Structure formats: C-alpha cells, structure tokens
A paper describes a structure:
The [name]–[name] complex (NXF1–NXT1 in metazoans and small bristles in Drosophila melanogastor) is the principal [name]-export factor in Sacccharomyces cerevisiae. [name]/NXF1 is a modular protein constructed from four domains: an RNA-recognition motif (RRM) domain, a leucine-rich repeat (LRR) domain, a nuclear transport factor 2-like (NTF2L) domain and an ubiquitin-associated ([name]) domain.
The ctMex67UBA fold was based on three α-helices similar to those seen in H. sapiens and S. cerevisiae and there was a hydrophobic pocket in an equivalent position to where a FG nucleoporin peptide binds in the H. sapiens homologue, indicating that ctMex67UBA probably also interacts with FG nucleoporins in a similar fashion. The ctMex67 [name] domain contained a four-residue C-terminal extension compared with the H. sapiens homologue that formed interactions with the end of α1 in seven copies of the eight in the asymmetric unit and which might contribute to thermostability. The [name] domains and [name]/NXT1 showed a high level of structural conservation (Cα r.m.s.d. < 0.8 Å), whereas the NTF2L domain showed the greatest variation (Cα r.m.s.d. = 1.9 Å). The [name] domain showed the greatest conservation (29% sequence identity over 55 residues), whereas the RRM domain had the lowest (15% identity over 73 residues).
Residue numbers in the entry:
A (entry chain F): 600 to 655
B (entry chain E), D (entry chain C), F (entry chain A), G (entry chain G): 597 to 657
C (entry chain D), E (entry chain B), H (entry chain H): 600 to 657
Write the structure that this text describes.
C-alpha cells in the first residue's frame, strides 16, 4: 500500500535500501515523506555504505 | 515488515519500467498478486497507454 | 464503465474501501470487474482488516 | 488519476439516495460537475424519474 | 424517445461519444440540451481525449 | 441504459443518410423496430418525402 | 563504535515501551535522531499502530 | 539487522551489558546472532558477575 510506496520512494530518491529507507519513515516522521527525506539529508554523513544500493 | 518486502518489488518495477512508485505498485497489486514477472508482463501489454506524466525515467525493458 | 464507477462497485460488493478496491482493478486485471472480484475472492483470507474500513480523512 | 476521489463521491451519493453506482454517478456528472450538494439537489428534483431497479438501499436524502 | 435523440445530438455537436454525451445530460442539466452543451464547453479541457470520436459540428 | 444504445443507432443512421437526429429516429422507430438495415432501407424508398431542411450532412447510404 | 551506545538506547526504549528490539529501534531512527525523549513521545502517539506481536514485555512508558 | 540491534538482542537474551554483548558478536561470529549466543552459552562460566545487568529471556 502507501507504506510500501513511501519506502520505495525514499529508496529511489536517497539510494538507500528499503531497510534503511523504512528507518527514516518510522518514528517521529510517522510516514511523512518530506520529514523522512529531510532526516536523511541531515544525517547522510552517518549512513553506512552497506545501506546504500544506488546513487540519489 | 511486509511493507519493506513489497517496497523492494515496487522499486524494481520502477527501475525496469521507468514508472513512478504509484504506477509501479499498480502493476503488482491485484491479479499479479506481487508476482514480479506477471507485473512486468502487465506493463509490457499496457505501456503505450500509461500516462506520460507517470514516467520518471525511460523504460529500460 | 468509468474507472470511478468500477472502483465504487468493487467497494460495494467486497466491502473494501476505495484504495484497496482500486488495487484489485489496476494492473493485470486492467479494470476488468470479474478478474478484480476473482482476485479478491482468491486473496480475501490475506487481506488486512484495514482494507475493510474507510481511510482517515484529510 | 482522480478516479478514487470520484469513487468516494459516488459512494456518498449512493449512501444518501439509495441509488446504485451507475445512477449515483449520473447525478454527479454533467452540470453538477461532481459537486456533492448539486448532485443531491438534482436527485431530489428528479427523484420521481429514477427506475426502481436502480435502488439498492434505503432512500434517506 | 427524446432521450435517445438528445444523447445523439450532444454527440454530434461536441464530437464526444454516446456514453459521455449521456453524462452531460443526466443530473443537474435534467436532459436540457443547452445546459448539457454548456457543461461540455466548460469541462472540455478536462474531458479525456478518449471520449472524442469526431470533430465538433456547429 | 437503453437510451444510449438507441442513440448509437440514431447516430449511425444520421451519419449514413445525412438526416438530423429527429428524422433519423423516425426511420428506426416503428416497423423497423430499431433494426439498422431495415431503417436504412426505409430511407432509401422514402427519401423523396424527407424535407430538405432535415439534412445536416452528406448523404452516403 | 557508536553501535554499543545506540544499543543502550534501544534497550532503554524496549524496557519502557515493551516493544522488541526491532520496533524499539524504529522509534529512535529517523527524525528523532536517537533522541530518547522524542522516540518515546513518538511511541505514545503511535502505540495503536504497533503490531501486538512486537511486544515482548510490559508497557510502562 | 543493524549492529546496534544485534547487540541489544544479545543483551536481552543473555542478560549481559552491551559491552560484553558486543564482544560475543565481534570477531569470528561476524555479527551472526546464533554464533554469538552459542559462544556465550559455551563461555558463560567465565563471564564476570558485574557484566550481568539482567536475567536471561527468550
């Protein structure tokens, strides 16, 4: 459904796999796409290489 | 979760077809029941009829 | 039949909300009512309780 | 696609008038331009002319 | 049998097919030809290209 | 409805004969009982009695 | 390095919410950015959507 | 699973603090939970009492 679409969208924009993409969406972002992507952009330096599958 | 597993399939359909995530999910849900091959087959049959605005990249297939 | 009436009819017959009803119609069913309903009938055991209640507004 | 939004308007008209999906859409399409209030007004004025088979639930406008 | 005539006339004037022509007549227009055509002219930009089976005729 | 189905037949008679929708319906109603071929046959025999003002397009039976 | 520090925060969320380690980490990652107060705040607001199977101890936020 | 999750899970299961839980995961276990737990069970007698900040669960 929309959760799956939202994870897929975060994965597409950021290049992170779905596991890490889901991490940005869960919690205080509460599946808000803008807040999830923002959190990634702010924390991008701290994301391990294994979490990345593609370029943004 | 199952959402994450479903998300991997949506992302793959989007990569291969060039469609955005909404339309990629459309191909998977329903009679394809998340069968990747059957979803891609549905795109092949319907691609000429997919709205132009629905595409974020060129179809790769 | 319009896309909107097909979604509404699937919603009526199955009891699912419009979001999940649309899911059955798009894709391999390609807006065929019988194939959408068949797919529901096959998958009904695995359909989430959330699919049967209306989605929160706004 | 705006189909889901339209489907919600059809469903609302059906609940209120008791009409099936086809006839509920008739009241919305055209001069009402999918305005719920105008659709319901049209039903009230033309209420006498809707065939009995078109009714799947209780009229409650 | 003026309903069939009215649907046929809207199709001819607008170039739209019969199904969608009927949509313009039913509802708030109450089968008034002018009001149906007004509704078409106002919504024409939003009518899908698929509905048009011919060029509009004065 | 049945109005829409009748309308596609009126439209076809109009296209073929050049008559407006009113006179096109005349050929279909009655003994032709909406049989397209019988309607066109009636036009061919009776064309001489249709007023010229009734014609809005090219005759092309 | 930072994994052990994160682990004590997960352990603390689990203790208070009753959620397993997977779902406890969910509240911490993302917009909370491992802020314990914001993670717990998020749980309190979203408890209804947490699957029952995710709970391995008593809720005591 | 993340390294942090794996440490937290070993801690929950064994009762060891996070520092000693991490010890079981790093090295030849290469962050495999089952081997970490196997190593704990085999070496449990040698773990100092101060390392245990809770009772073991499943």
């Amino acid at each position: 459904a929309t959760k799956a679409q939202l994870i897929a969208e975060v994965s597409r924009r950021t290049g992170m796999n779905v596991e890490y993409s889901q991490m940005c969406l869960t919690g205080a972002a509460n599946w808000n796409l803008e807040l999830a992507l923002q959190s990634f952009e702010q924390q991008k330096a701290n994301v391990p290489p294994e979490a990345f599958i593609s370029q943004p």
